[PDB]
Every structure is written in C-alpha cells, then in structure tokens.
C-alpha cells in the first residue's frame, strides 16, 4: 500500500501552492475579459499539420431549477429528446451528447418499441453519446461521495441495461466549482477522461498561460499517480456558444444560430448571427477559424474541442436545422480551403479525447500532473460562490439522513432474496432515484426555486418512507424464528424512531412507547448497526412512564437513565425562549451493543415504582424570574437558579465549562490536564447596501460578522449518569451541548425566522496557534489543507464543510464533525466557524430570480473533538492533505451512520430473536462497508451481492488499539461460488479472486466486490 502521509507527491501544479503564488488581479483583458489578447502564428498549422476541430452539440438539462423535474420534462426535455432522435436519425453526420440519465430514462420508458429501436441505433452508431452517464450532473461541494457514487451507479446501470453502453468520458459543465472526489470515483469506475468548466477566472487565466488546462488530475496524497485521470478544463467564462468558440464573445455569439430573432434570443454584444450563404461564407469562416485558432493556442495538441450548446437547447426542429445547416456550410467551406489548414466536423466528447490521446501517443504533447481542488469558485470580480455551501440547510441535512437510510435499507434487505410481492426492489429503486436526483447541482446546493425545493423535499420524504418499509420488513424477517415468520408485506411490524430527524422542535414525529399496567407491560425495540464493527451507542426512546427498565434478550438488566422530554418555545407573551417539560412522556436512554452489520433486541418494561437499574437525571433551569416546571411522575423535582457558570463531566470523559449564557468556554480532557479555552459564539453577517447582493449562490458579506445580542437567555442543565446536557434559548437558535462520556455532541435548532438579509454563523474561538491554516473535507472522503488568504475577500476564504473541519498547532487540534454540509472557514488563528442558515431578500443575478426567504427550522448536529496531537505522526508541512484521528472519525460515523432504532408495533412479537450478525467479522476501525446491495432479483439462479469497501486513513498517535478480524465480504453470505473485484458501479468485472476471497483495501482506497452464490 502507498503511504498517504509521509511522501509529498511531486506534481506540476498543486493547487494550494498555486493559490499561494497567484495574485488574483481582476484586470480587463480585452474581448476575453478575464484573459488577454491571444496571438498565434498562422504558420503553425499547414498541409502536414492541420487543426482538427470537433464541434460537439449539447443541451444542458437541469433535473429541477426554475421548474421541477417533471415540469421541465413536459415543457422542454421530452421535446429535445424526441427531436434529437428524429434529427440524428435523419442526418447521419450530426452528433449530440447527453448527460442526465434521470431525464433520458423518463423519456425512454415512454417511447414505443419502434422508437426505442431507432434510439438504440443512433447510440450504437455513435451519433448520440452519453457523457458521464449519472442520474444527474451532481454538485461537487456539498455531496457526499457515497451519493455521488449512488447516482453515477443509478444512471450507468440503466445505460448498461437499456442502451448497452458505459461512458468513459465525464462532462461536468455546471457544478459551481470542482472536487477531486470526482476523478477519484470516475477512475475507479472505468473512466479515462473528464471535463470541467466552473473554475475561478484567475485559475483559468493562470493555467491557460502555461497550457495547463489539460492535466492528469491525481489525488493530493497519491505519490505514484495511479489515481490520475486526464482532465480538460474549459477556458472561458461560460459553456454557452458565446464563450465556447473562442475568446471573443461578440464574435462567437454570431455563430449561435438560435439568436437571429424568431426564437426570442439575441446577442448582448449587439451583432447578430447571419445565415451563412455562398456570399458571406468566406468572411464568416475567416472570423470563426480565427477564434478557433486563438482557443487552440491555449492547449497542447492539434485537436480542438468546441462545445455547441446552452441550457435546454435543441428543442425545436427549426433550431436543429438552423444550427446544423449553418455549421454544415461553414465546414464545407473551411475544409475545402487549404489555406486554413483546418478539418472541422461535428463530433462527440469521446471522439475529442480519443484524438487528443492519439496526438499524445504520436509524441506531439505531454501533459502536466495536478493535484488539489477548484473551490471556492468565482465567475467574476469578488462574486465567490460560497453561499450555496449553506443555502436551504434543512434539505442539506435531509440529504445526509436519506443517505444513511438508503444504505441501511439496501444492507438490511440484501441478506435475503425477496419474493416480488414484497416490492423490495421497487421501493429501493424509488429511494435511490430520489436521493440521486437531489445530488443535482440545483438540488442539495439550495439554488432552486421554492416550489422546486418543495418537490425535492416531497420526493425525499417518499424515499424515507420507502426505506423505512424495507428496513422494518427486513428486521422482522432477520429476527423471527423461520418456521414462525409470516409476513404481510404491506404491514408495519416496526416503526423507526429517529431522535435527530426532523428533530425535537422541528416536527413532533416520534412515537411514544405506551406502557401501562392495564394495557401493555413491555415492548421490544431493535437496533441496527450498519457499520462493520461491534458498536455501542446510547439510544433513547420516548415512553409513557418514567418507571421503565431495560433488559437484553437474555433478560440481563441494562443500566438506563430517564430524563424529561423538554421542548423549547418562543413565548410571545413573556417574550422569552424557554423550555417546557412533558408531564406524560419521558425519555429512556441506555447503551445498546450491536454486532457488525447486525441487530440487537432489547425490552422496555414498566414497573410501579423506580426500577433498580434506571436512574433519573436532575434538571436545573437557570434564569431570572423562573416559574415552576412540573414533570408528572418524574421522580426528581426541577431546581432553579440565577444564571451562573457551570461545569459538567460525564463518566471519565472531559469536563466542560459553560458561561452563564449556556455556551461552552473550556474543555478539560482529564482530571490533571488544563482547562483549554474553547468558546462557542454566535454571530451574524449582513448584506451590502450598495453593489452586489448575496443570494442563493453568492456570499457577499457587508464585512466581518457581528455578535448576536443574547440578552439574558434561559439555560437548562440536565445532569445524568449516562447523559448530561446544557441547552440555551438564543435568538434564532436553541443551542445544545450533550455529553455522553466522550467528545460532546452539539445540536442547534436553527430558526432564522423573519430576519431578512442575515446569515447566522457559529464560531469556535480557541488559542490554538493555527495561523492561517485549517482543514476541510471534500465530499466526506478526504481532508484537504486550506490556507486563509488575506489577499482574497472574506467570502473567498469560505469552503464547503461537507462533513468536518479542523485546526491544529504542534500540540492541540480542534475538529468539528457535521451531520450536514454547511459552509465554513477559519478567519483568524485559533478559530473555526460554520454557517447555520441564511435568509436573503435579494436575487444574486445568476438566473434564479428570487432570494432565499423559505427558511424553516432545522436541527443541525455536530461532534466537537479537542485532542492532543503532539504524539501523532502527521504529514510534513508541504503535504496538501490532513487526516483524522480515530476519535474524530468515530465521531463523524456517529453523526452520519448512527444505530437505527425500531419499535415493535403490535403487542406481542411471536418468535422474536435477540440478535443477528453476532458471527459477522468486526473489521478494523478504518474500514467501512459503504454499500452492500443485492444485485439480482429472486428468479436468478445465481445470486449476486455487491459491496463497496472503503478504508480511510487515521493518524497513528500511539494507541496500540489492535486485535480485529479480517473482513472478507465475499464470505458474508453462504454458498459463495465466485468472488470478483469490479468497478465501483459493479458494471465491469476486473479480477476473478482466488479462493473467493475479497481482500481488504489500502488506506484511502475504495474497491468493489461482487460475490455470486448458488
């Protein structure tokens, strides 16, 4: 295995180093506004060396943005595809590329057989070519890598099944900045090439000057280069026709033949296109070939890519004709005029890349190696697109909840083969497709219109219900004696209980377990652990009595804690935010221990008085002017006091100190150690009163944030043997610090209310001497080093925080893990900050046509891990990556993939069993089974199950922590007959494995395996 820590890769372009050197001046470069006046030597191309030009027609079809997926399909996309089928069939030299398989599958299944056959024929002959082949063109900032892979696999599995093709070239013209997670996944999914577009205008200028727009993009820790993927970055401001023929949009706009008037489009540079004729074709060709030769100067081969398209183009038959006939006249002239030394034709993306690599093999060019990312994007001036790292945070959090529920549903149901009447495949396909659709670059990014966001939410809610159904049928089958198991596939044997989604104060969605001497003495509950190691985690349930005790299924008592159910209320009468306790529902909390990828059953039993193994939390309400807080049968009366600083310690864990406003002020790791200053603070950013306004995409603050004025907030302290917490009602945020014995969990119930033009940020202030360095993750896959640059504006120093961020010095590190993607930064040494929500009254001029005024309460979750790192083996100062410690990685897993909780729904569970998976191997902590999916329906003689195995890389800090089992996923199901390593989409077999054993993977690697069973 390659060492991902100690060897700094040698690359030609390392983006962090490039950023440190670049000046980012925004000067007027002439017609290429952000470039320079390109010059070329007319003698470069000649009879023996012609410029080969591929004009690639395309149509960017957003699966929701200003209209919903279905509205665009009915109004635009079905017409584009129907006319592409007709026009390509009738014009054999015409070509077209298609990216979004969600729309293609929606169209194809509505086609009659004759047209399906015609469609297959234009794909098979190369006229219609799929690029990427994912369900969508995903956001690359907020998306988790697991969901980028899910949506890629959904689209490519559909293409293999129905079109018999698997794209090896990727097209990503619209995500708002780009992540190396893409080439990581694509290269392990059979790809050979990829194309990107939205990168900072200063980066395009710098790379263009060095002809480094095509490069071998490798991961930041890859010393050898085996992860490298050839990448083409487009050079100009946009992917539309005006910014794709060459450097001068005035000129290129004249070659967009949809802009002469009858289509309602025009050229803003004020010169319209003119129909090509024999009287003007030589002058029009002179102008166009000059643009092409200028664009060609920015690249190293004699093969030039000219995209020809825009949003929802190629819709009308007349548009197909106007673009095709005019370009055919230009090609016929140009290709026959030897003096141009050009051969131009319609082409596809793969045709472009194949010709570039033929040139490279002929020795005509060598390409530079590059590592790093392309965040944060700015398309012009100081307009940095860091707002969408936070926009519509409720749905950003929902993405991570559904991510986990899809994984758990696919894994729980993979253990068995199911009759078609159980509708398991149907519900999992719906869930995978709705989650995949949301990965679109206007879905999770929060950049769609309000009614489109509602559509995505409704689709994800349906997907969650589908996952719950599959999960609860699976648990019933896995834990019921086989000869007693009697399923009704439409029945709810268990309901899921989720404590953090939508969350307390967001929705009253949780069911209370109703127990009573005159109704039901006890209730079974079951926990599922999707991770491949034994895991303990505290779990809680709402119960109708405080006198409840827990037992495992061998009837062994389990220590438990009962706490009240507290809800916070903005009291419009007293004008205070304060908690109210329930007098009939209580929370019972206990430690569940669950096998790797397994299930564990417990029983909750009511008693007439305090049970021997159940303790009760104390509660202290700190506020001036308190009033009583009755809790029914709860055995401990609530205590009151004036606001004051307080300290808490659960177990042998850290001791946390809090200010009189209920916010953390210090963390003491052990009895002897120092109280390390770690202060939480809430602040607000505003919007500019003149100039450009923040909106869904852009963050354009009116200066550094100002502290939220807190008043004298009400603080609630709950102290228990298993769990304690400090909660405070701040303006727009009920902030909660929860302690269970290890790093605390932070929960924020964020309700920005009617605060227009406000962004609420949560900041951590420490004295850690981090300087200008911090680390943020990319798609939940890797941590990349960031350097704050005071030569760039505040918003340029914000980066995506898809799952975590940290700062460190020689001795100390503070890591904040998140349960949802948000934007964040470190704006000064010792600080971390992460945006909670943003409400904006103005549109930011990117086409959305609205601000963001549809905020709703959201419960954000985090873990805060303060650690000593002076003993850790860390990368050298010049390495671009960072790595988590074991405790921070486990904390992230606790947020993203917690235990699932099931409540048996009827009175008696006949045939109940206590555990499933006790014999599953407990794999080393850095290894995960990211995906377990049965790939065959029950009628297949040979069953196939696919696994995606990911190993992260954790710092070695001196903990022996060893003795684990080898996990061979191919032997998890019985009767294995073959084991194969495959691409990550499971679509191509790469290696037939000896002894049917699937080897574990190296740190930072991801592999896929499929086991076949008779």
Ligand X SMILES: O[C@@H]1[C@H](O)[C@H](O)[C@H](NCc2ccccc2)[C@@H]1O
Question: Binds 240, which of ligand X, Zn ion, none (CB < 5 to 8 A, cut-off by type)?
Answer: ligand X
900 binding Zn ion? (CB under 5 A): no
Question: Binds 447, which of Zn ion, ligand X, none (CB < 5 to 8 A, cut-off by type)?
Answer: ligand X
Residues 708, 730: Cα–Cα separation, whole Å = 9
**Strand, coil or helix: what is 402?**
helix
Question: Binds 900, which of Zn ion, ligand X, none (CB < 5 to 8 A, cut-off by type)?
Answer: none
756 binding ligand X? (CB under 6 A): no
Q: Tell me how far, at minimum, the Cβ of 60 lies from Zn ion, in Å.
A: 6
Q: Tell me how far, at minimum, the Cβ of 245 lies from ligand X, in Å.
A: 14
Q: Tell me how far, at minimum, the Cβ of 307 lies from ligand X, in Å.
A: 10
Residues 732, 754: Cα–Cα separation, whole Å = 10
Instruction: Specify whether the CB–CB gap between 381 and 691 falls below 8 A.
Output: no
The count of other CB atoms within 10 Å of the CB of residue 966 is: 11
Q: In the sheet where 560-571 sits, what is the strand order? A: 512-513, 535-543, 576-594, 560-571, 614-616
847 binding ligand X? (CB under 6 A): yes
Between residues 214 and 310, which has the closer beta carbon with respect to ligand X?
310
Residue 592: how many CA atoms within 13 Å on its side-chain side? Answer: 30
The CA-atom distances, in angstroms, between 141 and each of 229, 759, 798 are: 19, 19, 12
62 binding ligand X? (CB under 6 A): yes
Which of the residues 225 through 284 are near Zn ion (CB under 5 A)? none
Question: Binds 255, which of ligand X, Zn ion, none (CB < 5 to 8 A, cut-off by type)?
Answer: none
Q: Tell me how far, at minimum, the Cβ of 698 lies from ligand X, in Å.
A: 12
The residue assigned the tokens 């198991």 is 485
Question: Binds 310, which of ligand X, Zn ion, none (CB < 5 to 8 A, cut-off by type)?
Answer: ligand X
Query: For the window 142-181, what string marks contact with Zn ion as x by the rule CB under 5 A?
Result: --------------------------------x-------
204 binding ligand X? (CB under 6 A): no
239 binding ligand X? (CB under 6 A): yes
Which of the residues 164 through 183 are near ligand X (CB under 6 A)? 174
Residues 568, 506: Cα–Cα separation, whole Å = 11
Q: Pick from 65, 171, 385, 566: which binds ligand X (CB under 6 A)?
A: 65
310 binding ligand X? (CB under 6 A): yes
Query: For the window 40-79, what string marks contact with Zn ion as x by the rule CB under 5 A?
Result: ----------------------x-----------------
Continuous H helices in 439-584 = 450-478
Tell which residue, 171, 172, 152, 149, has the closest CA to residue 160. 152
Q: Pick from 52, 58, 60, 313: which binds ligand X (CB under 6 A)?
A: 60
Instruction: Specify whether the CB–CB gap between 34 and 252 falls below 8 A.
Output: no
The DSSP 8-state label assigned to residue 119 in this structure reads: H
Between residues 174 and 497, which has the closer beta carbon with respect to Zn ion?
174
Q: Tell me how far, at minimum, the Cβ of 237 lies from ligand X, in Å.
A: 8
Q: Pick from 100, 240, 497, 968: which binds ligand X (CB under 6 A)?
A: 240
897 binding Zn ion? (CB under 5 A): no
The CA-atom distances, in angstroms, between 561 and each of 281, 542, 613 are: 83, 12, 8
Residues 1014, 635: Cα–Cα separation, whole Å = 58
Residues 691, 687: Cα–Cα separation, whole Å = 10
Question: Binds 379, which of Zn ion, ligand X, none (CB < 5 to 8 A, cut-off by type)?
Answer: none
- Stretch in the footprint of ligand X (CB under 6 A) among 440-448, 590-598, 820-828, 952-960: 440-448
The DSSP 8-state label assigned to residue 516 in this structure reads: B
Instruction: Specify whether the CB–CB gap between 551 and 922 falls below 8 A.
Output: no
311 binding ligand X? (CB under 6 A): yes
Output the 3-class SS for 661-686: CCCEEEEECCCCCCEEEEEEEEEEEC
Tell which residue, 588, 587, 585, 569, has the closest CA to residue 627. 569
Between residues 370 and 696, which has the closer beta carbon with respect to ligand X?
696
Which of the residues 947 through 1006 are near ligand X (CB under 6 A)? none
Residues 889, 893: Cα–Cα separation, whole Å = 6
Residue of 62, 174, 751, 809 with catalytic role:
174
Between residues 57 and 830, which has the closer beta carbon with respect to ligand X?
57
> Which residues lie below 8 Å from residue 253, measured CB to CB, with a gap of 6+?
241, 242, 259, 267, 268, 269, 271, 273
442 binding ligand X? (CB under 6 A): yes
Question: Binds 92, which of ligand X, Zn ion, none (CB < 5 to 8 A, cut-off by type)?
Answer: none
Between residues 387 and 532, which has the closer beta carbon with respect to ligand X?
387
Between residues 99 and 194, which has the closer beta carbon with respect to ligand X?
99
Question: Binds 126, which of ligand X, Zn ion, none (CB < 5 to 8 A, cut-off by type)?
Answer: none
Q: Tell me how far, at minimum, the Cβ of 65 lies from ligand X, in Å.
A: 4
What is the total count of residues that contact ligand X (CB under 6 A)? 13
Between residues 695 and 701, which has the closer beta carbon with respect to ligand X?
695
Question: In degrees rounded to 5, what are phi and psi of residue 386?
Answer: -100, -5
Sheet strands (E) in 157-223: 169-172, 193-196, 214-217
Residues 456, 854: Cα–Cα separation, whole Å = 14
Residues 924, 734: Cα–Cα separation, whole Å = 37
Give the orientation angle of helix 393-414 with respect to helix 450-478, to 10 degrees.
Answer: 30
Residues 119, 84: Cα–Cα separation, whole Å = 9
Tell which residue, 804, 961, 775, 964, has the closest CA to residue 886. 961
- Stretch in the footprint of ligand X (CB under 6 A) among 58-66, 341-349, 582-590, 892-900: 58-66
Question: In degrees rounded to 5, what are phi and psi of residue 738?
Answer: -115, 135
Question: Binds 135, which of ligand X, Zn ion, none (CB < 5 to 8 A, cut-off by type)?
Answer: none
Q: Tell me how far, at minimum, the Cβ of 33 lies from ligand X, in Å.
A: 15
Q: Pick from 2, 238, 345, 618: which binds ligand X (CB under 6 A)?
A: 238
- Stretch in the footprint of ligand X (CB under 6 A) among 236-244, 350-358, 533-541, 856-864: 236-244
Q: Tell me how far, at minimum, the Cβ of 434 lies from ligand X, in Å.
A: 19
Question: Binds 920, which of ligand X, Zn ion, none (CB < 5 to 8 A, cut-off by type)?
Answer: none
For the question of residue 174 being annotated catalytic, the response is: yes
Q: Tell me how far, at minimum, the Cβ of 66 lies from ligand X, in Å.
A: 8
Q: Which two tokens stand for residue 52?
A: 């080969």
Question: How big is the chain by its Cα radius of gyration, in Å?
Answer: 30
Residues in the chain after which the backbone breaks (C–N beyond 2.5 Å): none
> Which residues lie below 8 Å from residue 293, measured CB to CB, with a gap of 6+?
40, 42, 44, 45, 51
Q: Tell me how far, at minimum, the Cβ of 174 lies from Zn ion, in Å.
A: 4
Question: Binds 747, which of Zn ion, ligand X, none (CB < 5 to 8 A, cut-off by type)?
Answer: none
Between residues 59 and 153, which has the closer beta carbon with respect to ligand X?
59
310 binding Zn ion? (CB under 5 A): no
Question: Binds 847, which of ligand X, Zn ion, none (CB < 5 to 8 A, cut-off by type)?
Answer: ligand X
Between residues 392 and 441, which has the closer beta carbon with respect to ligand X?
441
Q: Which residues pair with 666 in a beta bridge?
A: 657, 677
Q: Tell me how far, at minimum, the Cβ of 976 lies from ligand X, in Å.
A: 45
Q: How many residues does the chain have?
A: 1014
Question: Binds 980, which of ligand X, Zn ion, none (CB < 5 to 8 A, cut-off by type)?
Answer: none
Tell which residue, 532, 388, 363, has the closest CA to residue 931. 532
Between residues 148 and 750, which has the closer beta carbon with respect to ligand X?
148
Q: Which two tokens stand for residue 653?
A: 């864990």
Between residues 291 and 445, which has the closer beta carbon with respect to ligand X?
445
Instruction: Specify whether the CB–CB gap between 888 and 869 falls below 8 A.
Output: no
Tell which residue, 796, 771, 776, 795, has the closest CA to residue 786. 776
Catalytic residues: 174
Residues contributing to the site for Zn ion (CB under 5 A): 62, 174
- Give the residues lining the site for ligand X (CB under 6 A): 60, 62, 65, 174, 238-240, 310-311, 441-442, 447, 847
């Amino acid at each position: 295995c390659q060492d991902v820590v100690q060897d700094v890769p040698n690359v030609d372009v390392q983006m962090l180093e490039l950023y440190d050197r670049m000046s980012f001046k925004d000067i007027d470069g002439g017609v290429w506004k952000q470039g320079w006046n390109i010059k070329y030597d007319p003698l470069k191309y000649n009879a023996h060396h012609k410029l080969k030009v591929f004009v690639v027609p395309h149509s960017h079809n957003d699966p929701g943005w200003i209209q919903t997926f279905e509205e665009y399909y009915q109004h635009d996309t079905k017409h584009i595809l129907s006319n592409a089928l007709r026009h390509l069939h009738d014009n054999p030299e015409m070509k077209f590329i298609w990216a979004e398989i969600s729309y293609f599958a929606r169209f194809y299944h509505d086609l009659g057989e004759n047209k399906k056959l015609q469609m297959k024929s234009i794909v098979k002959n190369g006229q219609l070519e799929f690029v990427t082949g994912g369900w969508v063109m995903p956001d690359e900032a907020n998306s988790h890598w697991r969901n980028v892979l899910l949506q890629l696999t959904e689209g490519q599995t559909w293409l293999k099944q129905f079109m018999n093709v698997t794209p090896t070239a990727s097209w990503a013209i619209d995500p708002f900045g780009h992540s190396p997670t893409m080439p990581y996944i694509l290269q392990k999914s059979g790809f050979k090439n990829m194309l990107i577009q939205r990168t900072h205008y200063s980066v395009k200028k710098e790379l263009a000057q060095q002809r480094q727009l095509e490069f071998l993009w490798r991961q930041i820790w890859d010393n050898k280069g085996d992860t490298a993927l050839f990448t083409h970055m487009m050079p100009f401001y946009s992917y539309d026709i005006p910014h794709t023929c060459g450097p001068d949009p005035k000129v290129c706009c004249q070659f967009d033949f949809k802009r002469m008037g009858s289509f309602g489009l025009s050229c803003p540079w004020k010169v319209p296109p003119r129909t090509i004729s024999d009287q003007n074709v030589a002058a029009r060709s002179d102008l166009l070939v000059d643009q092409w030769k200028k664009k060609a100067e920015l690249y190293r081969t004699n093969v030039l890519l000219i995209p020809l398209g825009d949003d929802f183009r190629f819709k009308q038959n007349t548009e197909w004709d106007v673009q095709r006939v005019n370009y055919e006249r230009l090609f016929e002239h140009i290709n026959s005029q030897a003096h141009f030394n050009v051969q131009a034709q319609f082409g596809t993306l793969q045709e472009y890349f194949d010709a570039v690599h033929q040139a490279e093999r002929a020795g005509q060019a060598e390409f530079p190696t590059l590592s790093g990312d392309f965040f944060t994007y700015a398309d012009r001036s100081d307009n940095y697109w860091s707002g969408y790292y936070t926009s519509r945070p409720y749905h950003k959090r929902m993405d991570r909840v559904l991510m986990h529920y899809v994984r758990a549903a696919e894994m729980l149901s993979a253990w068995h083969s199911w009759d078609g009447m159980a509708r398991i495949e149907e519900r999992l396909e719906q869930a995978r497709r709705e989650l995949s659709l949301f990965q679109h670059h206007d879905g999770i990014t929060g950049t769609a219109k309000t009614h489109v966001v509602v559509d995505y939410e409704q689709r994800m809610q349906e997907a969650l219900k589908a996952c719950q159904m599959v999960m609860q049928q699976s648990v019933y089958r896995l834990l019921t004696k086989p000869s007693i198991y009697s399923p009704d596939f439409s029945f709810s044997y268990f309901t899921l209980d989720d404590s953090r989604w939508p969350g307390s104060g967001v929705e009253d969605s949780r069911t209370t377990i109703i127990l009573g001497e005159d109704i039901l003495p006890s209730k079974h509950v079951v926990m599922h652990n999707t991770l491949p190691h034994w895991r303990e985690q505290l779990v809680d349930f709402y119960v109708s009595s405080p006198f409840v005790s827990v037992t495992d299924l061998a009837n062994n008592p389990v220590e438990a804690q009962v706490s009240p159910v507290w809800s916070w209320h903005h009291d419009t009468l007293t004008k205070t935010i304060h908690p109210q306790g329930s007098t009939t529902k209580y929370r019972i909390i206990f430690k569940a221990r669950v096998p790797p990828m397994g299930l564990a059953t417990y029983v909750l039993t009511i008693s007439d008085s305090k049970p021997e193994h159940t303790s009760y939390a104390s509660n202290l309400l700190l506020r001036k002017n308190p009033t009583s807080l009755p809790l029914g049968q709860y055995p401990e009366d609530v205590k009151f006091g004036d606001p004051r600083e307080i300290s808490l310690r659960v177990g042998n864990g850290p001791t946390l100190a809090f200010s009189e406003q209920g916010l953390l002020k210090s963390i003491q790791l052990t009895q002897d150690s120092p109280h390390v200053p770690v202060h939480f603070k809430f602040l607000k950013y505003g919007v500019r009163s003149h100039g450009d306004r923040s909106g869904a995409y852009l963050f354009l603050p009116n200066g550094p944030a100002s502290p939220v004025e807190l008043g004298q907030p009400v603080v609630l302290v709950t102290k228990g043997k298993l769990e304690s917490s400090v909660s405070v009602g701040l303006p727009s945020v009920v902030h909660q610090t929860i302690m269970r014995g290890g790093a605390p969990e932070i929960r924020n119930l964020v309700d920005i209310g009617s605060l227009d033009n406000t962004e609420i940020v949560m900041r951590l202030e420490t004295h850690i001497d981090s300087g200008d360095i911090f680390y943020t993750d990319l798609n939940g896959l890797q941590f990349i080093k960031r350097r704050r640059l005071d030569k760039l504006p505040l918003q340029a120093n914000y980066y995506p925080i898809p799952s975590g961020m940290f700062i460190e010095d020689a001795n100390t590190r503070l890591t904040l893990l998140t349960g949802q993607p948000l934007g964040g930064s470190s704006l000064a040494s010792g600080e971390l900050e992460i945006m909670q929500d943003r409400r904006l009254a103005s549109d930011d001029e990117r086409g959305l046509g609205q601000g963001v005024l549809d905020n709703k309460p959201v419960l954000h979750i985090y873990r805060l891990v303060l650690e000593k790192v002076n003993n850790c083996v860390r990368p050298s100062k010049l390495h671009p990556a960072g790595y988590l410690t074991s405790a921070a990685h486990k904390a992230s897993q606790s947020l993203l993939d917690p235990l699932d909780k099931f409540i048996f729904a009827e009175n008696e569970w006949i045939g109940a069993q206590g555990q499933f998976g006790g014999d599953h191997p407990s794999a080393r902590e850095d290894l995960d089974v990211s995906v377990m999916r049965r790939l065959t329906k029950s009628s297949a003689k040979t069953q196939r199950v696919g696994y995606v195995l990911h190993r992260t890389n954790l710092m070695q800090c001196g903990t022996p922590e060893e003795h684990t089992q080898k996990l061979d996923v191919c032997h998890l199901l019985p009767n294995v007959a073959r084991c194969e390593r495959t691409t990550l989409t499971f679509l191509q077999n790469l290696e037939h494995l000896d002894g049917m054993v699937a080897p574990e993977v190296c740190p930072m690697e991801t592999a896929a395996y499929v086991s076949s069973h008779s």
